[PDB]
Every structure is written in structure tokens, then in C-alpha cells.
Design an enzyme around this catalytic site. Structure first.
Site, PDB file in Angstrom:
ATOM      1  N   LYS B  82      22.009 -11.515 -25.258  1.00  0.00           N
ATOM      2  CA  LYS B  82      20.859 -12.433 -25.210  1.00  0.00           C
ATOM      3  C   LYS B  82      20.120 -12.364 -23.899  1.00  0.00           C
ATOM      4  CE  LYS B  82      21.533 -15.034 -29.054  1.00  0.00           C
ATOM      5  NZ  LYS B  82      22.944 -15.346 -29.291  1.00  0.00           N
ATOM      6  N   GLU B 104      15.141 -22.720 -28.180  1.00  0.00           N
ATOM      7  CA  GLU B 104      16.138 -23.228 -29.103  1.00  0.00           C
ATOM      8  C   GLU B 104      17.491 -22.646 -28.742  1.00  0.00           C
ATOM      9  OE1 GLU B 104      15.746 -19.188 -30.481  1.00  0.00           O
ATOM     10  OE2 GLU B 104      14.340 -20.671 -29.731  1.00  0.00           O
ATOM     11  N   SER B 371      28.458  -7.516 -29.275  1.00  0.00           N
ATOM     12  CA  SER B 371      27.333  -8.286 -28.765  1.00  0.00           C
ATOM     13  C   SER B 371      27.721  -9.300 -27.684  1.00  0.00           C
ATOM     14  CB  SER B 371      26.593  -8.978 -29.912  1.00  0.00           C
ATOM     15  OG  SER B 371      27.487  -9.748 -30.701  1.00  0.00           O
TER      16      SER B 371
HETATM   17  N1  LIG Z   1      22.257 -19.879 -32.513  1.00  0.00           N
HETATM   18  C1  LIG Z   1      22.520 -18.849 -31.450  1.00  0.00           C
HETATM   19  C2  LIG Z   1      21.650 -17.618 -31.674  1.00  0.00           C
HETATM   20  C3  LIG Z   1      20.226 -17.890 -31.917  1.00  0.00           C
HETATM   21  C4  LIG Z   1      19.317 -18.357 -31.022  1.00  0.00           C
HETATM   22  N2  LIG Z   1      18.087 -18.467 -31.617  1.00  0.00           N
HETATM   23  C5  LIG Z   1      18.185 -18.054 -32.920  1.00  0.00           C
HETATM   24  C6  LIG Z   1      17.213 -17.982 -33.919  1.00  0.00           C
HETATM   25  C7  LIG Z   1      17.606 -17.527 -35.152  1.00  0.00           C
HETATM   26  C8  LIG Z   1      18.933 -17.146 -35.403  1.00  0.00           C
HETATM   27  C9  LIG Z   1      19.899 -17.219 -34.408  1.00  0.00           C
HETATM   28  C10 LIG Z   1      19.523 -17.680 -33.141  1.00  0.00           C
HETATM   29  C11 LIG Z   1      22.313 -19.344 -30.021  1.00  0.00           C
HETATM   30  O1  LIG Z   1      21.638 -20.340 -29.794  1.00  0.00           O
HETATM   31  O2  LIG Z   1      22.804 -18.745 -29.064  1.00  0.00           O
END
Ligand SMILES: N[C@@H](Cc1c[nH]c2ccccc12)C(=O)O
Ligand SMILES: Cc1ncc(COP(=O)(O)O)c(/C=N/[C@@H](Cc2c[nH]c3ccccc23)C(=O)O)c1O
Ligand SMILES: N[C@@H](Cc1c[nH]c2ccccc12)C(=O)O
Ligand code: NA
Ligand code: NA
Lengths: 385, 384
Positions: B82, B104, B371
Site C-alpha cells: 500500500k 478510507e 503483499s
Molecule cells: N480495506 C483495506 C484495503 C482497502 C483500502 N481501500 C480499499 C478499497 C477497496 C477495496 C479494498 C481497500 C485497508 O483499508 O487497508
């Protein structure tokens, strides 16, 4: 064997044989190309070496003094420098026909590194860990378990590093023909202080090449935290013959040096013999070993490596101390300012580096060894702040 | 904007201006030497790229089939891929003159990566997180706090990832003048699926050079887990035009495909519009999005990126599912056999690679995108 008068091999006769076999094996393999091929292979593809040397630009400008570079051992597989030594010794142990690894741990990083190396090489791993350290470094306890290691809580004495080491040594006396005692700092009887230093010297070899690339010159100071002394020796050792480079080790100041609750062996300890070595140890009124303290469990040891005792004596390196609260502030500071959550051990080095940078010129260069990441310390930091 | 029929910009009129501005700024900077120099500098010295390609020899010999290599994104600063996207978008936001980042998060890893990137570049960070996820992810929320980010609970809807995106998008409508919405996967309205894929493509470019160095050839199969699909696109994308390279995306099979407790949008979902994109979603009869589940919180999303919908459609990639139990087995297996604790998300990919490797020859090569690391998941695995 010795660094000046310090070091040596002051053990029960039962361990002379095992230590001599280890000496012979290390002497045979330390400069063996094939051994180093396998070691370098794992360090690269499994551990992720080389680690970067990072210019902390926000931190530098904020302080307004010297340039602060961080050697990023926090990025090594496992989350600390310990892996460099763990893989090296595990490989040696496997070559010597050993099928079991034992190790002390305080922060749990060495325990984890040892468990990882043991998993990788198909060797059984038993880790001795002080009961207090089991509680305050629980993340690393469950890593060790998930890696297939057994974690043995030690309830005797201070329930910390020194007690873990006593139990491990007692195990090794009994199990040595098939067990390698994988010591995790530059401590214990010869040849361990040399072996661990040699396996950690990759930190400084990389950093030297990296700072020459970034700045076209050697650093003015190298700052590293000192528990037993391995990350410090690792980064120091390749610069020892460079006359420009000041070397500063940072011990755990604890609740204060007058509090009787600290781990600053070089600053406030006396010379003495324990755990197979002549070095500096915190001692009570009767001359016995007294319990240490640090908020950083990896620094919480009454002793220190004999090569640092030697560097202190010849004045090649300076040793300072940083308190728990100072270390906590550096933990928060680095996280907010650079987006790197450091190990509480490493936060001691950052803490002193921030003091030192402030007093220095903008032209000058400090390298701090960022020995680990702080994921293990989140419960500690949550309670304390 | 489109990948076949998928993708698009299914947003209110208030978001059309911001996205045009984002698209213009990205077209300007994406191929610019100065932007890329500064990006590569941070990726190298701060994030620790390149990550290694690791031959899992013990795991390979245990299964007894194809060679299993692991692309070690678990070693990136922050403990997951990420970070690659976080740095790229945060840097883009900074050159665009933005002072604030919103994002998010559900699992918490993107929130942490966004918080790290904001700390690095000296920008404010508010992380939107559904109320159910704030409760589920104590320590990631604490990591974000330590990095100087505010974590805002979202009590709209089902109080989870989909709702955090809606709350994040609501914020961005008002604040886009000074705020960049830093989206965490290859999802959302254009240009986000393209931008995130572009910032993750480095994984694949490294893996390609590393597998050629190690084996003198491209892999037979690449396996990556798919939540929204960013780590998968990152490793897939540089191989898309190598038609010999098989690409397998692994979705969360959860408690099982027939249990209705999974996040396999491509496998069991249907085409829909949500969060600015046309793609596959688990949804009810009215087109309303269904709740998803996975033991791996990073895969717990009812949708999936449109570029995967496209690759599925043209049959360039195959998409499969692995269950919670299978992923747990792989988690323990990899830890014990290679001394690498993987993220539960990544364990889905490992689980499938283990099944696939057994049916393949030793002279064949599987690259698994590892990952992330499993430090974030220790409580979940202990509690399972
Ligand atoms: N839920 C995971 C990965 C994620 C972030 N944004 C997303 C949008 C769509 C699908 C998965 C994600 C996180 O916050 O680390
Ligand atoms: C991230 C990190 N930084 C610094 C240190 C300080 O150690 P050193 O001075 O050797 O660089 C540790 C120690 N970690 C050990 C603590 C330890 C193991 N064996 C020891 C012997 C003597 C003293 C301390 C230890 C652990 O158990 O993880 C650590 O985990
Ligand atoms: N002074 C040593 C005595 C000792 C007992 N058992 C040992 C085993 C190994 C080395 C030293 C010892 C110590 O640190 O406790
Ligand atoms: Na000490
Ligand atoms: Na999904």
C-alpha cells in the site's frame, strides 16, 4: 579472545569443549566464500539487504543543526538488525551438525529472528524469555509461536534478559552436542562477541558506501543505542580506523541514573565478570550483579559487550545515556515527523541524535542506526502515553 | 477512463470538477522526470524498494511441484504494498498544492500507509473508517494516531469500508480545494483505478527483472490476492502483454462460496455501479451492495477494481477463491516452513499457489505476490 583486558572465556569446564568447537568452526567458515555465498543469498533475498540510508529532512530542518541520516535496520525481515546475526549463526550451527537452536530474548526481536532462521533451516527453536518481557512484548511472543518456536517464560530473579541468559546457559550446558546457543548480542564468552560483531558489520559496510554516495564524505558522528552492543558494533566497526568519525553509544538511562533503575553499564557500572565475560556490569554494595531497567526491553540488561568496554577505555567511542521519557518523546517525534515508528531501543539513539544535531553545524552529518521498528512496543507506548 | 465496458466516473456533478483537475495534474506529472525522481527517491530511501524476489525452496520441495517464488512486498516500509500508492498520491497531492490527505481504510493498513506518507510530506491526515472497523482494528488505529493522523468513525450505512468511502467522498466534495482523497485500491471513479495501478506497477517491473535474473525466463503463473485489486494489478500489469504468463487473482472465499459470507465479487458477484465505478459487486436484486466477509480484513470488500473485471472478461486473467480456513492453513504453513509471517490477505494467494504448484512440474515457476506481513493479523489468528 580479548579486547584489551575485556572479554575472555570465563565458563564452567563443561562449556570449554563446545566453545572451542565453535571457535574452530567459525575460524574455518568466517572467510569461507561458499559459507558467505549462502549467508549473502539469504540476507539479500530473504532478509531484504541492503537496507536504505534515509535522509530525515523534516527532522533535520526542525532541529536546525546537522543532517540526520537514518540507517534503516527497521526494514530488515523481522523488524530489527537481529536477523543479520540470527541467520549467520543458524547457518554456522547447521554446518556444525546442530539440529536445535536456543536463545535468550528481551525485546523478542532476537527470539523472533532466531525462530525465523530456525524455521527457514528446519531447526527446532526454544526461546528463553523473562516473564516481564513475555507480557510487555507479547506481539513477538505470538510471532515466535506461529513460527513454530517454543517460548519458555523465566520466572526467576528480575524476570528479564539476565535471567533469560542464565536459563539458556543452563540448558546449553546440558544440550550442547545437538544445540547451538544462538546468543543475540555482542556478549557472553569468546567467540560470541566477535561472531555477533562480524555478522552485524554489514550494517556499517553498507552505511559507509551509502553515505559516500549521498554526501561524498564520511559522517562526523555515528549514533547507536547500546543494550548489549550488537547494532552499535555493527555500524561502528567499519568506521573504527576512520579518524574523522566520532562514535557515540547510547545506553538506557531508565528512570534516571540516580534512580537505581537503568541499564547504563558503561556510564555507571563497574568492571567485573559475569556470563563468561569481563566487562562493565551494574553492581550492588556487595559487588554482585544488580537488576537493570529500561522502558525498552532490548536495552534492559545489567551488562554490556566487552568490545564497547575496550572502545570506552581507549576513548575511541563515547558513551552517553538517554532516559525512558526522552526515548518516549523521540518515539513519538520520529513517527509524526518522518512517518517511521521506531523501536523504543532505537528511540534512545534518535533522542540523543536530536540533542547532538541541535549543537552541531548544518554542514555536518550524523548517521543514526535505526535498529528496529516499533510495532512490538505499541502496548508499552499506549500505557505510558 | 474505461477498461472495456468497466470503470467510468459514476459520481455526482460536484465531483466532476475535482476529478478533471486530478486527471490534468496526473497527465502532467506521471511521465515528468522531476516527479519520478522524487517518487523513486522516497520509494528507495524511505520505503526500501526494491523488495526482493525470494525462492521459497522449502515450501517448494514440501509441495513437490512447481517452484514458488515470493515477491516480498511484506518488506516495504509499513509492512505492505500500500505504501507504493500512498507515496505516489501523497506526492502528487503535494505538487498539486494540497495541504490535507483523506483516505478510507477498513483493515487499517492503507490508513497507516496514508498516515505515514502524510507524516513524511508534512500534510494533515484524516482517515475515514467505518465504526465496526475502528472497533475491529485497535492497533492499526493506534499506529495511525502515533503517525499524527485523526481517525474519524463513520456510522452511516453498515458502518464499514463501503461507508467509509462514501463518507470520504462526501468530505472530498467540500474540501477538494485543499484536500486530496487518497484512494487505497484500484477502485473509485477515473482516474483512480489507473493512478493506483500505475503506482503499484513497480512491483511487477521489479519482479520481471528479478525472475529473469534468477531463472532466465518469465514465470508460468503469477498469483496475487484480490481485495479491490491493487497489489494484483501492480504485479500483473507489466506481464499483461506477455501472453504466455498466466495470471491468477485470488478472492476471499470466506466461509464458502455457497455460504453467502465471502467477498468474491468476480466469482459470485454481478455487474453494478458503486463508489464511482462500474465493475463487479456482491449485490441484492435492487442493485444495492451486499455485505461482504473475509477473515482477511483487506479482502473484505463487496466490490473489485474495474481493470480486473476487464481482465476477467477478455480471459487474460483467471479469478479463483480461497476460504478462511485455507488461508489460515497457508498462514501457518509459510510461517513454519519459510520463517515469513504473511498477511492474511497474502495467505489467500499462498494457499492457492500451494494447490496450483502440486499440479505443476518442478521446471515451472509460480510468483506469488506476498503483499504484506502478518504482524497486524496476530490477534485474529490467535483468536481463530
Ligand atoms: N480495506 C483495506 C484495503 C482497502 C483500502 N481501500 C480499499 C478499497 C477497496 C477495496 C479494498 C481497500 C485497508 O483499508 O487497508
Ligand atoms: C530493535 C532493537 N534495537 C536495539 C537493541 C539493543 O541490542 P544491541 O545492543 O545488541 O543492538 C535490541 C535488542 N534486542 C534483544 C535484547 C537482547 C538479546 N540478547 C541480549 C544480550 C544482551 C543484551 C541484550 C540482549 C532482543 O531480545 O530482541 C532490539 O531488538
Ligand atoms: N558468573 C557466572 C557463573 C555461571 C554459572 N553458570 C554459568 C554457565 C555459563 C557461564 C557462566 C556461568 C554467571 O554469569 O552466572
Ligand atoms: Na547495559
Ligand atoms: Na471483493
Amino acid at each position: 579472545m580479548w579486547f584489551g583486558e575485556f572479554g575472555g572465556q570465563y565458563v564452567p569446564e563443561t562449556l570449554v569443549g563446545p566453545l572451542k568447537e565453535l571457535e574452530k568452526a567459525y575460524k574455518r567458515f568466517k572467510d569461507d566464500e561458499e559459507f558467505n555465498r549462502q549467508l549473502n543469498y539469504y540476507l539479500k533475498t530473504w532478509a531484504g539487504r541492503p537496507t536504505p540510508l534515509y535522509y530525515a529532512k523534516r527532522l533535520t530542518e526542525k532541529i536546525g543543526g546537522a543532517k540526520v541520516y537514518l540507517k534503516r535496520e527497521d526494514l530488515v525481515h523481522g523488524g530489527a538488525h537481529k536477523t543479520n546475526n540470527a541467520i549467520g549463526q543458524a547457518l554456522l550451527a547447521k554446518l556444525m551438525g546442530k539440529t536445535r537452536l536456543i536463545a535468550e530474548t528481551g525485546a523478542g526481536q532476537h527470539g523472533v529472528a532466531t525462530a525465523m532462521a530456525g524455521a527457514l533451516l528446519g531447526m527446532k527453536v526454544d526461546i528463553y524469555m523473562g516473564a516481564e518481557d513475555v507480557e510487555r512484548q507479547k506481539m513477538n511472543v505470538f510471532r515466535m509461536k506461529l513460527l513454530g518456536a517454543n517460548v519458555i517464560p523465566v520466572n526467576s530473579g528480575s524476570r528479564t534478559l539476565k535471567d533469560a541468559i542464565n536459563e539458556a546457559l543452563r540448558d546449553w550446558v546440558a544440550t550442547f552436542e545437538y544445540t547451538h546457543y544462538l546468543i543475540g548480542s555482542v556478549v557472553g564468552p569468546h567467540p560470541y562477541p566477535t561472531i555477533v560483531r562480524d555478522f552485524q558489520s554489514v550494517i556499517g559496510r553498507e552505511a559507509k558506501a551509502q553515505i559516500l554516495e549521498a554526501e561524498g564524505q564520511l559522517p562526523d558522528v555515528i549514533v547507536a543505542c547500546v543494550g548489549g552492543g550488537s547494532n552499535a558494533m555493527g555500524i561502528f566497526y567499519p568506521f573504527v580506523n576512520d579518524k574523522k568519525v566520532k562514535l557515540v553509544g547510547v545506553e538506557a538511562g531508565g528512570k534516571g541514573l540516580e534512580s537505581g533503575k537503568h541499564s547504563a553499564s558503561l556510564n555507571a557500572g563497574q568492571v567485573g565478570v559475569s556470563h563468561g565475560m569481563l566487562s562493565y556490569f551494574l553492581q550492588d554494595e556487595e559487588g554482585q550483579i544488580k537488576p537493570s531497567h529500561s522502558i525498552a526491553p532490548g536495552l534492559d540488561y545489567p551488562g554490556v559487550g566487552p568490545e564497547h568496554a575496550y572502545l570506552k577505555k581507549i576513548q575511541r567511542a563515547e558513551y552517553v545515556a538517554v532516559t525512558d521519557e526522552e526515548a518516549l518523546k523521540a518515539f513519538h517525534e520520529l513517527s509524526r515527523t518522518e512517518g517511521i515508528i521506531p523501536a523504543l531501543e532505537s528511540a534512545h539513539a534518535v533522542a540523543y541524535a536530536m540533542k547532538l544535531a541541535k549543537e552541531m553545524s548544518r554542514d555536518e552529518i550524523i548517521i543514526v542506526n535505526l535498529s528496529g521498528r516499533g510495532d512490538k512496543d505499541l502496548d508499552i507506548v499506549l500505557k505510558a502515553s
